[PDB]
Amino acid sequence: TALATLAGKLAERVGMDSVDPQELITTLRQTAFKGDASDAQFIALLIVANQYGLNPWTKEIYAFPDKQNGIVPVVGVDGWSRIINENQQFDGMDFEQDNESCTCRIYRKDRNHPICVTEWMDECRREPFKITGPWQSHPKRMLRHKAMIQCARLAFGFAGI
Amino acid sequence: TALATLAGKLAERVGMDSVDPQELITTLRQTAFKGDASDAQFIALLIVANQYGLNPWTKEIYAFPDKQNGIVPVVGVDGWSRIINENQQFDGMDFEQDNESCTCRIYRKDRNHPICVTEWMDECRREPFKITGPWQSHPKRMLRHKAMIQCARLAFGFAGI
Amino acid sequence: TALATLAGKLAERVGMDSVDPQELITTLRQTAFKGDASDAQFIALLIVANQYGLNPWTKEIYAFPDKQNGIVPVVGVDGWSRIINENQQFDGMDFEQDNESCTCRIYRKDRNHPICVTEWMDECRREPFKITGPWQSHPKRMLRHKAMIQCARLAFGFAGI
Amino acid sequence: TALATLAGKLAERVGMDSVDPQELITTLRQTAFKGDASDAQFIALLIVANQYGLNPWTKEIYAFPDKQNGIVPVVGVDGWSRIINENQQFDGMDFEQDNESCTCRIYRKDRNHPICVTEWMDECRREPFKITGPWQSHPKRMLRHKAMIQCARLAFGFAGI
Amino acid sequence: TALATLAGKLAERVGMDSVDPQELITTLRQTAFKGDASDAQFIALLIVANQYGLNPWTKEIYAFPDKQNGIVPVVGVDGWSRIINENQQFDGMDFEQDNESCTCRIYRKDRNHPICVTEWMDECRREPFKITGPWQSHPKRMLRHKAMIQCARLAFGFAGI
DNA sequence: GCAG
DNA sequence: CTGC
DNA sequence: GCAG
DNA sequence: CTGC
DNA sequence: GCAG
DNA sequence: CTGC
DNA sequence: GCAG
DNA sequence: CTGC
DNA sequence: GCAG
DNA sequence: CTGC
Numbered sequence: 001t002a003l004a005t006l007a008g009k010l011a012e013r014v015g016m017d018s019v020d021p022q023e024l025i026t027t028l029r030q031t032a033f034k035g036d037a038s039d040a041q042f043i044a045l046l047i048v049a050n051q052y053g054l055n056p057w058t059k060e061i062y063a064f065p066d067k068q069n070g071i072v073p074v075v076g077v078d079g080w081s082r083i084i085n086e087n088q089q090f091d092g093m094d095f096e097q098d099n100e101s102c103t104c105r106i107y108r109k110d111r112n113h114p115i116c117v118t119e120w121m122d123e124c125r126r127e128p129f130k131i132t133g134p135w136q137s138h139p140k141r142m143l144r145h146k147a148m149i150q151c152a153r154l155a156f157g158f159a160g161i
Numbered sequence: 162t163a164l165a166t167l168a169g170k171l172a173e174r175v176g177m178d179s180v181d182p183q184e185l186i187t188t189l190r191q192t193a194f195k196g197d198a199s200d201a202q203f204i205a206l207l208i209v210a211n212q213y214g215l216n217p218w219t220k221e222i223y224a225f226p227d228k229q230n231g232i233v234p235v236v237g238v239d240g241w242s243r244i245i246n247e248n249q250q251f252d253g254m255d256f257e258q259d260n261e262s263c264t265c266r267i268y269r270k271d272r273n274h275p276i277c278v279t280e281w282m283d284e285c286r287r288e289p290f291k292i293t294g295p296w297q298s299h300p301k302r303m304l305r306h307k308a309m310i311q312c313a314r315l316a317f318g319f320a321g322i
Numbered sequence: 323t324a325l326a327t328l329a330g331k332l333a334e335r336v337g338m339d340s341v342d343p344q345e346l347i348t349t350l351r352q353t354a355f356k357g358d359a360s361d362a363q364f365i366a367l368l369i370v371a372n373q374y375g376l377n378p379w380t381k382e383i384y385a386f387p388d389k390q391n392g393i394v395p396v397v398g399v400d401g402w403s404r405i406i407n408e409n410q411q412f413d414g415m416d417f418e419q420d421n422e423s424c425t426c427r428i429y430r431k432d433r434n435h436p437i438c439v440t441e442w443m444d445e446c447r448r449e450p451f452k453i454t455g456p457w458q459s460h461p462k463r464m465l466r467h468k469a470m471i472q473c474a475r476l477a478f479g480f481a482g483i
Numbered sequence: 484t485a486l487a488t489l490a491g492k493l494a495e496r497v498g499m500d501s502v503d504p505q506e507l508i509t510t511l512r513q514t515a516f517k518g519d520a521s522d523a524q525f526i527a528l529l530i531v532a533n534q535y536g537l538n539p540w541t542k543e544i545y546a547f548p549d550k551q552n553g554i555v556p557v558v559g560v561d562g563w564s565r566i567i568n569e570n571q572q573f574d575g576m577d578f579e580q581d582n583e584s585c586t587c588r589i590y591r592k593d594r595n596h597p598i599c600v601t602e603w604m605d606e607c608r609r610e611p612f613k614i615t616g617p618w619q620s621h622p623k624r625m626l627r628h629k630a631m632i633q634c635a636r637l638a639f640g641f642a643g644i
Numbered sequence: 645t646a647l648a649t650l651a652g653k654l655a656e657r658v659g660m661d662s663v664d665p666q667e668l669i670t671t672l673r674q675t676a677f678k679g680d681a682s683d684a685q686f687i688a689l690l691i692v693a694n695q696y697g698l699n700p701w702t703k704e705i706y707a708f709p710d711k712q713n714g715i716v717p718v719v720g721v722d723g724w725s726r727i728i729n730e731n732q733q734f735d736g737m738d739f740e741q742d743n744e745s746c747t748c749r750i751y752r753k754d755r756n757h758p759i760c761v762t763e764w765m766d767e768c769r770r771e772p773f774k775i776t777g778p779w780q781s782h783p784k785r786m787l788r789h790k791a792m793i794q795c796a797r798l799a800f801g802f803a804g805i
Numbered sequence: 806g807c808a809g
Numbered sequence: 810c811t812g813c
Numbered sequence: 814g815c816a817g
Numbered sequence: 818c819t820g821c
Numbered sequence: 822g823c824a825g
Numbered sequence: 826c827t828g829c
Numbered sequence: 830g831c832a833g
Numbered sequence: 834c835t836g837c
Numbered sequence: 838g839c840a841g
Numbered sequence: 842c843t844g845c
Contacts, residue, residue, distance in 0.1 A: 001340050001341075002333070002338040002339055002340055002341050003338075005337075005339065006337065006338060009337070010208050011163070011204060011208060013208065013211060014204075014207045014208045014211050015166075015167065015170070016163040016164075016167060016204050016207060016208070017163055017166065018162050018163055019162075019163050019204060020201075023199065023200075023201035023230075024201050024204060024205065026201070026230060027199070027201040027202055027205045027230055027231060027232065028205060030227065030229055030230060030231030031205065031209070031227075031231045031232055034227075034231065034815095038345065038349070039345075040342075040345035040346050040348070040349040041349055043333060043336075043338050043341060043346060044346065044349045044350060044353065046336045046338060047332050047333060047335065047336045047338070047379075048353070048379055050335060050336050051377065051379045051380060052380060055212065055319075057208075057209055057212045058212060058213060058319060059234075059815085059816095060319070062815050062816095064814095064815085064819080064820070066352060066353075066356075066820085067820090068352055069345075069348060069349055069352060070349060070352030070353045070356065071349065071353055072814090072820070073381075074814070074815055074820095074825095075815095076815060076816080077314075077815085077816080078314070078318065078319065081314055081315055081318035081319075081320075082318050082319055082320050085315075085316075085317060085318040085320035085321075086320035086321060090272065091272055091273050091274060092269075092272040092273055092274025092275065092276055093274065093276055093315070094274065094276075094277070095277070095278075107273070107274055108414075111412065111413055111414040112413050112414055112429070113413060113414025113415065113416065113429055114414065115414055115415055115416075116416070116417070117417075117466075119463070120462055120463075123459060123460045123461070123462065123463070124460075126814080126818095126819085128818095129813085129818045129819070130818085131813095131818090132813085132818095133813075133816085133817090133818060133819090134813090134815095134816050134817055134818090135816090137284060137817080138284045138285075138816085138817075139284070140281055140284065141280070141281075141284070141311070141816090141817095142816075144278075145816075148315070150463070153399075153400070153403055154403055154407075154415070154470070155407075156407060157400065157403035157404050157406075157407040158377075158380060158382070158400065158403075158404055158407075159403075159404050159407035159408035160407075160408060195807095220807085220808095223807050223808095225806095225807085225811080225812070227812085228812090233806090233812070235806070235807055235812095235817095236807095237807060237808080238807085238808080287806080287810095287811085289810095290810045290811070291810085292810090293810095294808085294809090294810060294811090295807095295808050295809055295810090296808090298809080299808085299809075302808090302809095303808075306808075323501050323502075324494070324499040324500055324501055324502050325499075327498075327500065328498065328499060331498070356823095360506065360510070361506075362503075362506035362507050362509070362510040363510055365494060365497075365499050365502060365507060366507065366510045366511060366514065368497045368499060369493050369494060369496065369497045369499070369540075370514070370540055372496060372497050373538065373540045373541060374541060381823085381824095384823050384824095386822095386823085386827080386828070388513065388514075388517075388828085389828090390513055391506075391509060391510055391513060392510060392513030392514045392517065393510065393514055394822090394828070395542075396822070396823055396828095396833095397823095398823060398824080399823085399824080433573065433574055433575040434574050434575055434590070435574060435575025435576065435577065435590055436575065437575055437576055437577075438577070438578070439578075439627075441624070442623055442624075445620060445621045445622070445623065445624070446621075448822080448826095448827085450826095451821085451826045451827070452826085453821095453826090454821085454826095455821075455824085455825090455826060455827090456821090456823095456824050456825055456826090457824090459825080460824085460825075463824090463825095464824075467824075472624070475560075475561070475564055476564055476568075476576070476631070477568075478568060479561065479564040479565050479568040480538075480541060480543070480561065480564075480565055481564075481565050481568035481569035482568075482569060484662050484663075485655070485660040485661055485662055485663050486660075488659075488661065489659065489660060492659070517831095521667065521671070522667075523664075523667035523668050523670070523671040524671055526655060526658075526660050526663060526668060527668065527671045527672060527675065529658045529660060530654050530655060530657065530658045530660070530701075531675070531701055533657060533658050534699065534701045534702060535702060542831085542832095545831050545832095547830095547831085547835080547836070549674065549675075549678075549836085550836090551674055552667075552670060552671055552674060553671060553674030553675045553678065554671065554675055555830090555836070556703075557830070557831055557836095557841095558831095559831060559832080560831085560832080591736075594734065594735055594736040595735050595736055595751070596735060596736025596737065596738065596751055597736065598736055598737055598738075599738070599739070600739075600788075602785070603784055603785075606781060606782045606783070606784065606785070607782075609830080609834095609835085611834095612829085612834045612835070613834085614829095614834090615829085615834095616829075616832085616833090616834060616835090617829090617831095617832050617833055617834090618832090620833080621832085621833075624832090624833095625832075628832075633785070636721075636722070636725055637725055637729075637737070637792070638729075639729060640722065640725035640726050640729040641699075641702060641704070641722065641725075641726055642725075642726050642729035642730035643729075643730060678839095703839085703840095706839050706840095708838095708839085708843080708844070710844085711844090716838090716844070718838070718839055718844095719839095720839060720840080721839085721840080770838080770842095770843085772842095773837085773842045773843070774842085775837095775842090776837085776842095777837075777840085777841090777842060777843090778837090778839095778840050778841055778842090779840090781841080782840085782841075785840090785841095786840075789840075
């Protein structure tokens with residue numbers, strides 16, 4: 001039942017009145033939950049994403065199905081990129097990199113002291129699946145994503161969201 | 162049903178009253194979704210593009226059909242080019258390039274510290290399909306597109322859109 | 323009974339009216355309480371998390387089932403990251419690390435004297451379970467989490483929350 | 484009788500109306516009083532914790548059952564960490580440590596003279612139970628907890644709480 | 645009779661309406677008076693603690709049953725720690741220690757001259773009972789408690805309480 | 806990763 | 810012209 | 814740990 | 818393409 | 822002690 | 826993947 | 830003396 | 834995992 | 838003299 | 842665990 005009013009209201013938002021809900025629900029469920037996902041897991045992702053204050057369609061927040069029908073949420077690089085950019089006290093940021101590490105420093109206008117975090121590649125890197133992943137094809141970008149996330153967890157966090 | 166009122170209303174916007182909807186729907190579906198695409202995937206692209214705040218006809222945002230009838234969205238260089246240009250706090254940008262890297266730095270009026278990102282060609286470049294692509298015929302432009310996108314993800318993101 | 327109104331109200335918050343509560347309750351219970359958990363233990367986690375002033379869905383606070391049907395609460399790195407960031411008197415922080423220790427110093431605007439704490443790896447590190455954990459794959463990050471928590475216990479604590 | 488209205492009111496505080504009180508009371512009793520505890524000992528912990536001005540669910544204050552059905556209260560490191568942090572005259576603190584001692588000095592804004600206390604490990608350390616405790620696995624942290632408590636007993640105490 | 649209204653009112657202070665008073669009275673009597681104590685001795689401790697201006701539940705003041713049914717009051721280290729900390733004229737304190745003595749000096753804002761007292765271990769120390777006491781396991785702390793008490797008797801006393 |  |  |  |  |  |  |  |  |  |  002409830003997924004048909006969600007699919008309908010979302011369609012009505014783009015002016016697409018009177019869709020067949022079943023093919024649309026299925027399409028949308030496989031968009032946010034890539035892979036198999038009970039409707040109970042799909043509606044759980046919608047309420048959890050609202051608790052974080054983040055948008056699932058935009059891929060600001062992911063989730064994957066747990067063993068025994070729970071879910072596991074995962075805030076992405078775009079979720080943290082929202083959180084630091086819609087706060088008025090942010091004052092810019094800078095980075096440093098080499099063959100093995102990345103450093104990221106965040107400044108804010110009210111706080112006198114910048115906050116700085118350093119990440120390390122050989123603990124962040126992942127082995128090839130099975131086969132080729134982004135940790136094989138793009139390593140120097142993939143580490144800089146991780147160092148920004150870890151700094152924004154401390155400089156801002158979820159406080160005020 | 163709903164695609165015929167979409168095709169009709171869009172036509173009525175250019176003063177083309179009383180079109181035959183079936184040939185127009187087909188034409189329009191193959192414009193935004195290049196290649197085969199269920200109507201459920203086509204109406205999903207319309208609602209997702211509205212969630213990002215971007216226009217599909219203008220190619221600010223693409224999508225491709227997933228395996229098992231989902232979709233995958235892709236914000237293009239014109240989507241980020243909109244997002245940084247319709248924000249009042251943007252204060253210009255500069256670039257640096259060589260045989261192997263591109264750097265892009267974005268300034269904003271309220272933030273004291275510029276934000277700067279660097280991209281690398283030999284991880285961004287793609288192998289020839291099958292046959293000749295833009296990563297064969299235009300490499301020095303194709304990298305500069307990637308470095309602008311990656312910087313605009315951090316300097317602005319989706320915050321306030 | 324009471325879990326069905328909780329699951330319902332939470333769904334109504336995301337606009338998902340008239341869900342089947344049983345599959346949703348089960349999904350949600352296994353999200354916050356990973357593993358087996360009586361409904362009496364699940365409702366105990368909800369009231370305890372409110373007493374700390376922290377959110378369970380966001381993983382700011384965990385709990386695990388005790389022997390003889392109690393529970394054990396555990397404030398996480400995101401719980402302390404909230405608490406120091408939603409307080410107006412925080413004035414930034416800095417860190418120091420090596421092969422064996424981490425130091426963290428917290429400043430505040432009203433207090434003249436910074437507060438500083440040091441942690442040590444060979445007492446904080448954990449042995450492999452059974453098999454590979456984060457204390458095997460990520461040690462230099464895992465220690466820095468512990469040193470921030472221990473400092474924030476003294477510089478702020480639960481005073482005013 | 485009275486425990487069912489306590490369990491009920493606490494549940495009503497998290498919006499969980501109409502719980503079965505018996506499983507909840509049992510769960511809660513085993514949370515605050517770990518181990519066996521008469522209801523008369525459980526309600527005694529609630530009134531004593533109010534006299535100190537501290538919260539039992541948060542583990543700011545513990546108690547254990549006496550021989551002949553009394554109780555013994557124990558203010559924890561988080562109880563003293565509350566008491567020094569919710570007082571306006573606190574002005575920061577500093578520490579010193581070595582192989583055998585810890586010193587802690589507390590400053591306050593109105594008092595001209597700081598107050599300083601020193602603790603010693605070989606009198607504070609405890610022998611292994613029966614088997615491995617925190618006085619085996621974490622000694623350098625476990626002593627620093629004791630030195631802060633002992634200083635805060637003199638610099639603030641219970642005056643004004 | 646009177647103990648049931650005391651136990652009741654105290655419970656009503658923590659919101660525990662309609663307790664069985666007999667098990668609660670017994671629990672509370674054995675908390676403040678550890679060991680056997682007539683109800684006449686228990687109500688005598690309550691009125692005497694009010695005359696000193698100190699709280700019995702908090703262990704600011706102890707008592708023990710006399711031979712021939714009197715009582716003996718004993719102000720503790722927390723009773724003196726209250727008395728010097730809730731007085732506005734206190735101006736901090738300092739200590740000196742060695743193998744055999746402890747010195748404590750108290751300053752106050754209105755009085756020009758600090759007051760200083762010295763204690764000695766071999767007269768303060770106690771022999772083992774029967775078996776191991778705090779005068780065996782913690783001697784350097786146990787003496788510093790005695791030197792603070794003796795100084796606070798002269799620098800403040802009960803004047804104005 | 807989708808640009809020409 | 811491609812998507813784990 | 815989820816990015817391309 | 819993965820989750821203790 | 823619970824993070825990835 | 827763990828809790829005296 | 831109760832912390833992890 | 835402990836309390837004279 | 839009663840603290841842990 | 843103690844009180845002349």
